[PDB]
Write an enzyme that holds these catalytic residues in place. Structure first.
Site, mmCIF file in Angstrom:
data_model
loop_
_atom_site.group_PDB
_atom_site.id
_atom_site.type_symbol
_atom_site.label_atom_id
_atom_site.label_comp_id
_atom_site.label_asym_id
_atom_site.label_seq_id
_atom_site.Cartn_x
_atom_site.Cartn_y
_atom_site.Cartn_z
ATOM 1 N N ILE A 10 0.866 -1.160 0.000
ATOM 2 C CA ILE A 10 0.000 0.000 0.000
ATOM 3 C C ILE A 10 0.900 1.205 0.000
ATOM 4 C CG2 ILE A 10 -1.816 -1.228 1.378
ATOM 5 C CD1 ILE A 10 -1.240 0.300 3.746
ATOM 6 N N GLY A 12 10.647 4.008 2.790
ATOM 7 C CA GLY A 12 10.620 2.537 2.597
ATOM 8 C C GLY A 12 9.429 1.975 1.812
ATOM 9 N N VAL A 14 5.668 0.090 2.284
ATOM 10 C CA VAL A 14 4.541 -0.151 3.219
ATOM 11 C C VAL A 14 3.508 -1.258 2.775
ATOM 12 C CG1 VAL A 14 2.703 0.924 4.589
ATOM 13 C CG2 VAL A 14 4.806 2.224 4.162
ATOM 14 N N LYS A 29 6.003 -1.278 7.802
ATOM 15 C CA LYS A 29 6.980 -0.590 6.989
ATOM 16 C C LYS A 29 8.318 -1.341 7.038
ATOM 17 C CE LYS A 29 8.125 3.582 8.415
ATOM 18 N NZ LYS A 29 7.512 4.995 8.631
ATOM 19 N N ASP A 122 6.971 18.134 8.411
ATOM 20 C CA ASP A 122 6.608 17.630 7.080
ATOM 21 C C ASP A 122 5.094 17.449 6.955
ATOM 22 O OD1 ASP A 122 7.634 14.773 4.992
ATOM 23 O OD2 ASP A 122 7.188 16.781 4.401
HETATM 24 C C1 LIG Z 1 3.790 7.510 2.846
HETATM 25 C C2 LIG Z 1 3.433 6.773 4.133
HETATM 26 C C3 LIG Z 1 1.939 6.644 4.426
HETATM 27 C C4 LIG Z 1 1.549 5.185 4.200
HETATM 28 C C5 LIG Z 1 0.395 4.542 4.971
HETATM 29 C C6 LIG Z 1 -0.945 4.240 4.612
HETATM 30 C C7 LIG Z 1 -1.481 4.569 3.374
HETATM 31 C C8 LIG Z 1 -2.821 4.160 3.197
HETATM 32 C C9 LIG Z 1 -3.505 4.427 2.021
HETATM 33 C C10 LIG Z 1 -2.831 5.104 1.025
HETATM 34 O O1 LIG Z 1 -3.476 5.346 -0.082
HETATM 35 C C11 LIG Z 1 -1.498 5.491 1.174
HETATM 36 C C12 LIG Z 1 -0.809 5.242 2.363
HETATM 37 N N1 LIG Z 1 -1.661 3.602 5.580
HETATM 38 C C13 LIG Z 1 -0.801 3.472 6.574
HETATM 39 N N2 LIG Z 1 -1.047 2.850 7.848
HETATM 40 C C14 LIG Z 1 -0.010 2.873 8.698
HETATM 41 C C15 LIG Z 1 1.247 3.398 8.373
HETATM 42 N N3 LIG Z 1 1.498 3.935 7.186
HETATM 43 C C16 LIG Z 1 0.423 3.993 6.241
#
Ligand SMILES: CCCCc1c(-c2ccc(O)cc2)[nH]c2nccnc12
Lengths: 288, 149
Positions: A10, A12, A14, A29, A122
């Site tokens: 979905i 680093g 993820v 992650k 950020d």
């Molecule tokens: C760029 C990092 C955000 C990624 C992320 C998502 C995430 C979920 C849906 C998206 O379309 C894009 C990123 N969901 C998460 N849950 C727990 C930890 N990180 C994430």
């Protein structure tokens, strides 16, 4: 990662995954430790340190950290989407109560960070995670840092351009919790319109122009130390009289007031997260 | 005193005293190993300015006092643990987003450096933030570091 079953992808990669032992769904992650491109682990380690000390319902929750094979595995609570995807899912059109709800949660998480002496640095829609329950979490603390110690300066080079405040664009080397309040104001503006960046400049000069052109150029009296900043340059004097009404149509006079409190160019004049949470825009509301 | 060289020397004297098994450790060895990383990272364009300043040496000493065992059994192992604590200081306190591993690695077993990173963070993450947030704590640590000489 024996304990976890990867369901789908979905600094680093993820994945949505399942705990084989409880069947709970989490986000994983992965941080590669033998990378070709030096760097990454350093920011992951800073993120782990901060996130171990930031447990709040509106901050993305780190559950655990696994070290196996040539990787670090960070286990977080799972969130379905980021604010960017959310804007796409709903034609960029939020009901005003959801606008208010998302700003509220954002301020609570941010309030929590700042009271713990952490700067996020950020804040942007892709660093904001939204649950199917409507719960927003600040995420991605890779650029964050503790503050309080005496230092000659911080990195002048933080926040994606569109969310960076004027003092930082003018090259301020020291800043406080104010840097995140500016970015929170930018996001508030997206939520309150059609979900597009308020100030999409192509470079620094263009960015400052977009800001001043809407908000007015700050004078010497509102911002005495402005012309002294490292990358200060004379800007045209755009008038302070331009209406915000069409810029943020989901908002009445009460929300427009809060927006202008967040979007003050002089950082020392920006409302803090805690004060913003006591603003009349949140007066009735619910999640208090 | 208030200068980086002085505090580095207090730190070096602290390490020789803590690591009582290391009979041939010089108090300048730790200064030399730290100065070396910093100058390397600068010359190779990883940072614009040196990391070693008075506040960061205090920060480093705070990790060392709690992480470095009195039972370290070689100068090499002491260099490896110190370099671990230094790498965590750069990650946590440094102005750059990321720093390369290379200058901080002196062990052939990479997995042990990372295990040690995770274990120092699990012991120390609370104090790492507290020394930023609590100015009287920063003062206490700075003061203990000076009283190391
Ligand atoms: C760029 C990092 C955000 C990624 C992320 C998502 C995430 C979920 C849906 C998206 O379309 C894009 C990123 N969901 C998460 N849950 C727990 C930890 N990180 C994430």
């Amino acid at each position: 990662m024996q304990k976890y079953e990867k369901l789908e992808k979905i600094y680093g990669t993820v994945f949505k995954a399942k705990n084989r032992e409880t069947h709970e769904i989490v986000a994983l992650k992965r941080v590669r430790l033998d990378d070709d491109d030096e760097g990454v682990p350093s920011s992951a380690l800073r993120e782990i340190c901060l996130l171990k000390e930031l447990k709040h319902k509106n901050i993305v929750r780190l559950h655990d950290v696994l070290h196996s094979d040539k990787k670090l595995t960070l286990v977080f609570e799972f969130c379905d989407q980021d604010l960017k995807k959310y804007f796409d899912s709903c034609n960029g059109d939020l009901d005003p109560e959801i606008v208010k709800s998302f700003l509220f949660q954002l301020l609570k998480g941010l309030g929590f960070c700042h009271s713990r002496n952490v700067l996020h640095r950020d804040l942007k829609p892709q660093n904001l995670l939204i649950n199917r329950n409507g719960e927003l979490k600040l995420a991605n603390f890779g650029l964050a840092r503790a503050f309080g110690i005496p230092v000659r300066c911080y990195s002048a080079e933080v926040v994606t351009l569109w969310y960076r405040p004027p003092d930082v664009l003018f090259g301020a080397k020291l800043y406080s919790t104010s840097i995140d309040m500016w970015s929170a104001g930018c996001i508030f503006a997206e939520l309150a319109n059609a979900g597009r960046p308020l100030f999409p400049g192509n470079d620094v000069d263009d960015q400052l122009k977009r800001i001043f052109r809407l908000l007015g150029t700050p004078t010497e009296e509102q911002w005495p130390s402005m012309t002294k900043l490292p990358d200060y340059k004379p800007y045209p004097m755009y008038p302070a009289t331009t209406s915000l009404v069409n810029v943020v149509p989901k908002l009445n006079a009460t929300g427009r007031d809060l927006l202008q409190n967040l979007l003050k160019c002089n950082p020392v004049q920006r409302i803090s997260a805690e004060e913003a949470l006591q603003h009349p825009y949140f007066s009735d509301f619910c999640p208090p | 005193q208030a200068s980086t060289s002085e505090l580095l020397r207090c730190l070096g004297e602290f390490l020789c005293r803590r690591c009582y098994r290391l009979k041939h450790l010089s108090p300048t060895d730790p200064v030399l190993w730290l100065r070396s990383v910093d100058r390397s990272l600068l010359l190779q364009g990883w940072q614009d300015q040196g990391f070693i300043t008075p506040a960061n040496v205090v920060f480093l000493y705070m990790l060392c006092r709690d992480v470095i065992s009195s039972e370290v059994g070689s100068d090499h192992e002491l260099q490896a643990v110190l370099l671990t604590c230094l790498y965590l200081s750069y990650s946590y306190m440094g102005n750059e987003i990321s720093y390369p591993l290379k200058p901080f690695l002196v062990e052939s077993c990479k997995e042990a450096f990372w295990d040690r990173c995770l274990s120092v963070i699990n012991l120390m993450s609370s104090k790492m933030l507290q020394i930023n947030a609590d100015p009287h704590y920063f003062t206490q640590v700075f003061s203990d570091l000076k009283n190391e000489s």
